[PDB]
Amino acid sequence: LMGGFGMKHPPPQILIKNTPVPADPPTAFNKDKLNSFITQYSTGQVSVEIEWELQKENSKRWNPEIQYTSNYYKSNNVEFAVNTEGVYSEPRPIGTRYLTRNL
Amino acid sequence: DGVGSSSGNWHCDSQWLGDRVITTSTRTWALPTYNNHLYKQISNSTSGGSSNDNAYFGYSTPWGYFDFNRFHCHFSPRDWQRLINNNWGFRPKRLNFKLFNIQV
Numbered sequence A: 001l002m003g004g005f006g007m008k009h010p011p012p013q014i015l016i017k018n019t020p021v022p023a024d025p026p027t028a029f030n031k032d033k034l035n036s037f038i039t040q041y042s043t044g045q046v047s048v049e050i051e052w053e054l055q056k057e058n059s060k061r062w063n064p065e066i067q068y069t070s071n072y073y074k075s076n077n078v079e080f081a082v083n084t085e086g087v088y089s090e091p092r093p094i095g096t097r098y099l100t101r102n103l
Numbered sequence B: 001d002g003v004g005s006s007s008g009n010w011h012c013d014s015q016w017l018g019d020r021v022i023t024t025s026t027r028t029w030a031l032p033t034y035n036n037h038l039y040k041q042i043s044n045s046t047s048g049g050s051s052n053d054n055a056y057f058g059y060s061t062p063w064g065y066f067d068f069n070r071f072h073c074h075f076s077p078r079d080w081q082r083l084i085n086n087n088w089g090f091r092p093k094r095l096n097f098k099l100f101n102i103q104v
Helices: B077-086
Strands: B013-016 B021-024 B040-043 B057-060
Touching: B021 B077
Parallel strands: none
Antiparallel strands: B013 B021, B040 B057
């Protein structure tokens, strides 16, 4: 209902965790679970590649269609770009329904 | 062929391949008799003009001619929109021309 493709078997959840690294344990045995760990965090790169199938348009419409376009008029910043502080912004939501076909 | 058989069909469509687009256009034309079958010498004197920048000499022929040297003769507005919004360049490659269904 929020939009998209419904699947019984969607892309699986990918779960990641840092393995706990205990600190120095006491020299005398204690049966309680360890609660002293080395403070750690992890970093790395993640890549995802998705192949999309396209349905081309075969319209016989004579007049030009409505198309999504940027506005040429001057502005302080370029839409869908970074600001002077390096902050990326999306200025508007973009749908998918601009081309037309008969009902 | 014969009087009662068409000599061609109406072909008017655009086919969009990967790196190529093929435009086909068919039109109905009418051809009258020009100059009453005569060749006539023409000039700025025969059209009454007397400025030297507009002076000319030439001939008018009883022949007509077919001209399709404008882009809208081949591209519909939607095809033109697709071409201009999806391509960095284009150029003509080859031509096919047909005259058929002659009626005098």
